[PDB]
A paper describes a structure:
The resulting proteins, Rtms5Y67F and Rtms5Y67F/H146S, have green fluorescence emission (, 508 nm), and are the first FPs reported that have both green emissions (500–525 nm) and a phenylalanine in the chromophore tripeptide. Each of the protomers in Rtms5Y67F and Rtms5Y67F/H146S consist of the same 11-stranded β-can motif typical of members of the GFP-superfamily of proteins. Located at the core of the barrel is the circularised tri-peptide [name] chromophore maintaining covalent links to Cys65 and Ser69 of the main-chain. The structures show evidence for the presence of an acylimine linkage extending the chromophore conjugation system that contributed to the green fluorescence emission.
Within the asymmetric unit of Rtms5Y67F there are 2 tetramers with 222 non-crystallographic symmetry which both match the biological unit predicted by analysis using PISA and the biological unit observed for [name]. The imidazole ring of His146 in Rtms5Y67F is rotated around Cβ towards the benzylidine ring and contributes to a significant increase in the non-coplanarity of the Rtms5Y67F chromophore compared to the [name] chromophore. The benzylidine moiety of Rtms5Y67F is twisted out of plane with respect to the imidazolinone ring with tilt and twist angles of −178° and 53°, respectively averaged across all eight protomers whereas the 4-hydroxybenzylidine ring of [name] is twisted out of plane with respect to the imidazolinone ring with tilt and twist angles of 170° and 43°, respectively. Two waters (W292 and W1092) not observed in [name] or Rtms5Y67F/H146S, contribute to differences in hydrogen bonding around the chromophore of Rtms5Y67F. The Nε2 of His146 forms a water-mediated H-bond with Oε1 of Glu215 through water molecule W1092. Notably, this water is within 2.1 Å of Cβ2 of the chromophore methine bridge. It is possible that the proximity of W1092 to the methine bridge contributes to the observed red-shift in the absorbance spectrum of Rtms5Y67F compared to that of Rtms5Y67F/H146S by coordinating increased electron pair density on the bridge of the chromophore.
Numbering used by the authors:
A (entry chain B), C (entry chain C), D (entry chain D): 5 to 65, 69 to 225
B (entry chain A): 6 to 65, 69 to 225
Amino acid sequence: MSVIATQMTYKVYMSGTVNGHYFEVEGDGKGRPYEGEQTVKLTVTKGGPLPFAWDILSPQCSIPFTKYPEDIPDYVKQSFPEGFTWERIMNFEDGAVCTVSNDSSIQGNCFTYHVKFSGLNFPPNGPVMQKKTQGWEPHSERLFARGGMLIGNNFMALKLEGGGHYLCEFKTTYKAKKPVKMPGYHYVDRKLDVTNHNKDYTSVEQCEISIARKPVVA
Amino acid sequence: SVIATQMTYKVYMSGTVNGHYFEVEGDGKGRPYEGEQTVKLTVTKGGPLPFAWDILSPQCSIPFTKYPEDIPDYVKQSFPEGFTWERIMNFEDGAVCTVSNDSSIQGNCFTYHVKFSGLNFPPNGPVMQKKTQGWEPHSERLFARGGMLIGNNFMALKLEGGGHYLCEFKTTYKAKKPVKMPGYHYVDRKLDVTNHNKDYTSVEQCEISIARKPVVA
Amino acid sequence: MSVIATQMTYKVYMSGTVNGHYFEVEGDGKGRPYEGEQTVKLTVTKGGPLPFAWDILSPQCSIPFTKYPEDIPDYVKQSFPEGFTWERIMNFEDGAVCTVSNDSSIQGNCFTYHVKFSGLNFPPNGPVMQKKTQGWEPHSERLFARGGMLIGNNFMALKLEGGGHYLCEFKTTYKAKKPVKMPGYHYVDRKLDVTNHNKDYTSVEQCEISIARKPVVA
Amino acid sequence: MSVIATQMTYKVYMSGTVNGHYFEVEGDGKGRPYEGEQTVKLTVTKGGPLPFAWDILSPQCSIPFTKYPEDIPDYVKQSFPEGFTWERIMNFEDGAVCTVSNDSSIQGNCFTYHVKFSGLNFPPNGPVMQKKTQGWEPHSERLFARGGMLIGNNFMALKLEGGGHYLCEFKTTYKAKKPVKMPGYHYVDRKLDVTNHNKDYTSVEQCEISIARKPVVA
Ligand SMILES: [Cl-]
Ligand SMILES: [Cl-]
Ligand SMILES: [Cl-]
Ligand SMILES: [Cl-]
Ligand SMILES: [Cl-]
Ligand SMILES: [Cl-]
Ligand SMILES: [Cl-]
Ligand SMILES: [Cl-]
């Protein structure tokens, strides 16, 4: 509030393994935390070119940049300056599973995100390992308070080259490092776009819009 | 077309919850194109039910969903041949239900035949102890696959004394003939039990359902 | 051996739906409860010829016929004459789910099983709806006590025409209708064999051997 | 086939995160690969004392040490000298999920295991974060061949302080780095015993017996 300015930058440090292939990624992002608008530029710094779809990593690259209306408590923004962690499970319909963890901290006008990524049982002839994916559909996260924590669930879908969808379910648990005022039951609508990349996706630029709201029919 | 701006319907439901057998009959009406409907349910066999009415309320009407013109309406197109649905419900304490529906049309009246099977509800959990207080408004992600419409919802039952009891629905809609398939979209709903008797052997509920594109797109 | 004779008969009544297809089945069985051997003959009395693999129904057609060594409490036999129920979830690797409930009672020398079967989301071109299955691999149930109940889990596999397996996970909860002495952590090994059938599986004969044991390596 | 000696040593290097908490572990093992007997000494080298049950790490600390009968192809031993990887998903009954990967290689008389562990959504008041677990029951893996890989499934159970079990399912995929002769459907029975440890589990000694077999009732 005082803590988070209307324009902020951030830094992403991600490392992990997909089917045992190790990688590191660094990003530089910026956006407007109260408008729910952000952009980031990512470089694969280790283990590139990645032999799997960039798309599984794009949503691990920024929760404080969500536009919350005044009458819904904003759990993440409240968690600063101490900050918060998040823990994500991703269950893909062909049996692949990822677990992703983030620590999020603030230094002046900059957030820092440390992300560990672990994914496996992606089928070798499936669309992640053959790189046949073409972006996530726009998605919606169901959010509710439980034991001091914010719990989110999304039905996600990757568009497939040649048509059709490849489904994934996200469960993300957000954990503020102090007690904050808990929101009621609500949603966050997002779209995540890859707006630029080089040929082997060792460089990527992404755009996201995130807006909290009440249920549409209530 | 086939579907009038005002329609009634009849629900015949039967099934078992933790092995306890029941039948329910219902009388509904609403406006298919406005996504508004109301039903009165009677437990006709196996009442009073020793579990929460709320697990049955979402099984009692897909034609009554307001579709905008630029989103094909899968279900309404399936008439007069009609359609079936197959639902799985996975509750967070391990309970699972499988529910199947057949929907048909006779003039001005739909008929829904519903078979419900739920089990592994913990004897001391909120369903068996009747501690649930209705569903949160919910949202269904819908997409097309192999001529079928596949829906998924994160549902939540409100609990007496506070907190939620979670359930994930997967519902697959199967038109009995080919129809024009819609793109990726959502349906928002609110289901409210507006009346009931002391033991929930008689229940009235009201549902609003509205289709839309993604909000942020 | 005062409630359960060394030779018993049984009657099965099963009804249910698969992908909305309604059916009924009746069976006459016989066996040696203490030897863990049994045979049953089944007839599809309503809804036949069934448009799906008989194999999804075969395991639902008799727990009292399991050979328990003397030093492992036999939850199911102890429940008699009052009897017991079971509740089963079946999760198939292509997304199909079944839920099955049984009530088991005893009248003299005969058990009666009432079974309600509900299965759905079987892909139209998958192995069940296309009848491509060729019996169940021999299987093992992991069994432990909790809350006065016996809880069982099995990794099951259907053999496929042309090679390969089609996987299914079972979870079965056994509920004695009176309190009984609870067994420790143990296993039941079974093999279910279809030994005869007519061309459309409207008549089926099955044999099952079931023997309880302690962990092999302990 | 004597790339693998009758007595062998190994080195384990494990790193990972549990609920965001980073750790590293090193171990020194020895055993008899043809007898399915092995023991290992573990040291938490970074991030100790760990704020969670050692027990969730103990099964990530040795597949070549399984006794195979001659008439069951031994997928893992055949993989050497090229070796193999494995990818494991653990689903705990209270919603916790871990993803574990291993690379296994051989140099002379010594195996080297590199293991990456990612666990999260352990409830703060659950038995893992409150350290209420007292070892794994002996367990049994169902194994079959698929697409040149070996697929395994176990129903596991941790014993609890005060009585009761805390359940976990393991799905493990073994991937040989060259083609090998594939086994039919079979099981491996194991017991994993922590035979010594210090007060905060920063040092641990473990013993494992593993033996493959055909189905007991077939
Ligand atoms: Cl895989
Ligand atoms: Cl709370
Ligand atoms: Cl239960
Ligand atoms: Cl389609
Ligand atoms: Cl289907
Ligand atoms: Cl007990
Ligand atoms: Cl948690
Ligand atoms: Cl193979």
